[model samples]
Target: GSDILRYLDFSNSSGQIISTVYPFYVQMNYFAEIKYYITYHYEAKKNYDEAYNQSVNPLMSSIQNQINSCVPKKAALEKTIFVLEYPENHNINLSNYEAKHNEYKQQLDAYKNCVQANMESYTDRMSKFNEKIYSILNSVKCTDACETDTYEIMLEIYVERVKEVNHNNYVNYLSTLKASLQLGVTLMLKVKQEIDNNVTISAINFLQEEMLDIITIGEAHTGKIIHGKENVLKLQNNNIPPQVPLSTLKKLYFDSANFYATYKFSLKRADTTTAALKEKGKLLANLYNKLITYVSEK
Candidate 1:
């Protein structure tokens, strides 16, 4: 715990601890849009919807409770950041921040190794629904040639978070985040205009319902990286043993696991017009590459 104490402030605060714990929460609203279409799919084909509702609804409320209880503690830490900045000179009570820090730190501990079994079970519950979601998507994929630019939306958010914080350590990490985001945004744009002009696959509302949520959380992770770098107490990549793909998956977001599969299946349908096929070809090509860059970029 002492390792993280050497560095903690606004722009790279314990706020990230809150976000990294529950990256999918932001996407729940966006998932509703896709869920409607998915319900349509299930109605015509299957009846596992009840199982989904039973599990997902309760699980959501629990996660919501975590956020409800967690957000203020994180904010309290963010607000008390000045106390860390001017420790000796500041008028703040040193123990006041100290107590909040331990409380907030305890919360982050719940996310990582300390509450290890609980975190694993939490992720396992989410994966159960995700497996069901993918089984359905693979069977009936969206085959639209018109590529929607989610990365552009992500780029805008990344740009905003970049705007909201500009420390030197933040700069190094942003250079990484900025490059990946720009590459992702520009590739979609250039390829989109290129393929879009020749054929017609417009108005295809490809339901990437989770992308917005995943992107929204990217802003939090910019804090993660900025926090990681600004956090010179230094967690060398090797400090902790790898928690396997699940941990890294959570970092890039488990939602993109769906996003990647969705795009892969979309590119294959014969119903795709000549234009949509090439457009989707370009779309799927580098999608995972950009996502992979999100984690461990330090």
Candidate 2:
């Protein structure tokens, strides 16, 4: 039920709308990866092999669709940016503006479909994993040491997957998108004042929704980060021998801990950025109101 809503660009400039919405779409990819590995300890020993084999093609396709759709749209927007900006300096036509809005809606629908499918795959895997967990827990013979080893192995695997997800293609894609959306929305507010219309209103609304998405996912990541750190700390403090190799586990833990810390900071930074956007939204509203008053006086 976690929803990442689409943002629209009303500026009749494909460049402006695409800039903001693209990042939000890319962020959905991150959600897919995070959700896939979120609850590892509960089901590490489950039928991952079967699930992976059965779902790998569909999962990869879903992810690839997200990436493929985004790349071309970005290039197209960048290519047409100058053309669109040129018209802003001269006369603007309200009729041509419809093109940008329609484009935004069409692309947004495509992006959402990919996100929806990717999430479905993530949920399917998790369900299968939980089924395995339930089977194991129901058995009377499941020993304490066995459970402990399973937990450790789960953490170990989850940490590695997190590392991979962080360093992979979607990570940088989202990073650039986040940076761009910040700037894009900033300029968008100023542009809204110039146009004096409801289109700007739509743009502002889209940015707000995207920020909410980041805060929601970032909060979830924080929970996982803390959970990982606590588990590692417990292992380090415990006096038991034959515990998963302290030397090895400690190294992986350090890697994951550092990564998680960096991720948390990025989320915090994003939250701050979102606050700035909200403030800008207020400024934009005031600007529109003032423009209305000035026009009425004339």
Candidate 3:
């Protein structure tokens, strides 16, 4: 081998002589084959070391990390199931959630078992170059999440929900009724004083018109109910019998001046008589005070 390797050495004018020799030419060709094998052997060994580092050594923890990463996703999925399964949450069509959760759970359980069972054999991995190993690792995937659940709410349910939502609307409306209509009572009393001073009914009407801004919050609000607009319209729909004195008073508050603009089709000059308008004005203020008391009691 040293004699063969000498052909490649720099101080080898002797190589030219050897190269011309018929006997040495075949020997030099054979040396080329041997040199190629030796150089390739070093490269193969270098590749083998790189393969062990990249493919075999880290494989065990790679699986461990896969499980670790999947755990939080599993926990979050369970928590979502937990919340949905809570009876008081009123989760409708819960069977779908449970079914999808079971499906995902089966997949994850399959994934878990696959991960657990395929614990890498370091020696076996050394034989393999990581392609097959990494491919196996990725083959079984953890659960992404339970499948999506969709439901279309029925109209009855829609109205029921609307009713529940409007409960607070009524609560808030009642509160403002007492607050805003307190100003209304004050206006009604002022209207009564003018009536006693013998102002025309137009003056009374204009005075009530001026009162609209302060009285508006109570007038404008409704429960916005699907089936229960009455919750807000109750004040407008007061059932007062004629001659009850409050009949004219209620009219004066609503139709007396078309205070809501909606009341135009309905009118009052509730009493054209001076004595009656004067008396109804006083009665109107009393009615507003009573309404405030009624709402507060509620």
Candidate 4:
């Protein structure tokens, strides 16, 4: 019933040979699934980057300039207010001081009005930015679902093929893989949960880190299976040919290895951007606090 199993027969079968064949079969299939995932995930990252640069970057720059200009304006207003309140150095008459105080108060009110209007504009921009990011994240969910289904289907087919080849030899191996599949599913959902909860830029870093961990753990498991195959090959004049060619497995290994390296590089880039955004957010928060403080003072 399986494509790979159609090639196998009862000819000269041993548990040792079955062990080698069986794991090799599953390993190759798993790596193929991984290859599919990497391709899909990479494309998604590119889409996210392009969407972010187009929609978010320009809006953020405008907001940043608004905040930067407000910072100096805020500092100057605070200085003017402080001098009016203290009036420590000037020998001005009380009536003149009172008039200037009223004038300064009017200026302060106008400045607050302007800042409030800018804040409203900033809020509107942020709302749109959030909508776009969430839309992109929603698209990622579809890709995640497709990858999950592909891995499940590939594993199920592998199990069926293994049952035909030597069920006893591969049952435990299949079950272990099934367990790992579940764990991967759980981790993926956790990544989605963070994004769903309005943690977009930070969530991107978290998602990439989890994906890298999966690749690392997967490589370790596959590396062990390939190592076992190598030891099997050292048997001179052996009756057992490998279930899958060593050369084929090596190709998958190297291909996935290179992708893993590139994945980490992109993840690092995402982290740097996230860090920079957080710093900018802190500046905005400080400006907001100043707006509140100056508005409340006498």
Top model by lDDT, which number?
Answer: 2
Q: Write model 2 residue lDDT over 36-116, tens digit each, in one string.
A: 332443342244334444554455555556656655654554333322323333344544544654565565565445444
TM-score of each: 0.34, 0.36, 0.18, 0.31
- Candidate 4 has a TM-score of 0.31
lDDT on C-alpha atoms for all candidate structures: 0.37, 0.42, 0.33, 0.38
Q: How close is candidate 1 to the true structure, as a TM-score?
A: 0.34
Task: By lDDT, rank the candidates, best first.
Answer: 2, 4, 1, 3
CA-RMSD of model 3: 42.9
Report clashes for each candidate as comma-separated counts.
1, 0, 0, 0
lDDT of 1 by residue, 1-298 (tens): 1112112211223241222232333233323424543343444234345655777778767766665565555555544433333333454454554554455456544433332224446667766766665454443333332122332233233334334534444334435544554565555455456442211111111102112222334334443444433222221212423233322322232233233222222222211222232333344344334333432262
The CA root-mean-square deviation of candidate 2, after full C-alpha superposition on the true structure, stands at 11.9
Off by over 4 Å in 4: 1-44, 68-76, 118-121, 141-298
Clash total of candidate 3: 0
Better model by TM-score: candidate 1 vs candidate 4: 1
Candidate 1 Cα errors over 4 Å, as ranges? 1-34, 37-49, 86-89, 92-117, 134-173, 176-257, 260-298
Q: What order do you get sorting by TM-score, best first?
A: 2, 1, 4, 3
| Structure candidate 2, residue pairs in collision | none
Per-candidate Cα RMSD to the true structure, in Å, reads 23.2, 11.9, 42.9, 25.9
lDDT of 4 by residue, 48-118 (tens): 56765675556556644554555555555545544443342454445565565566657655544544445
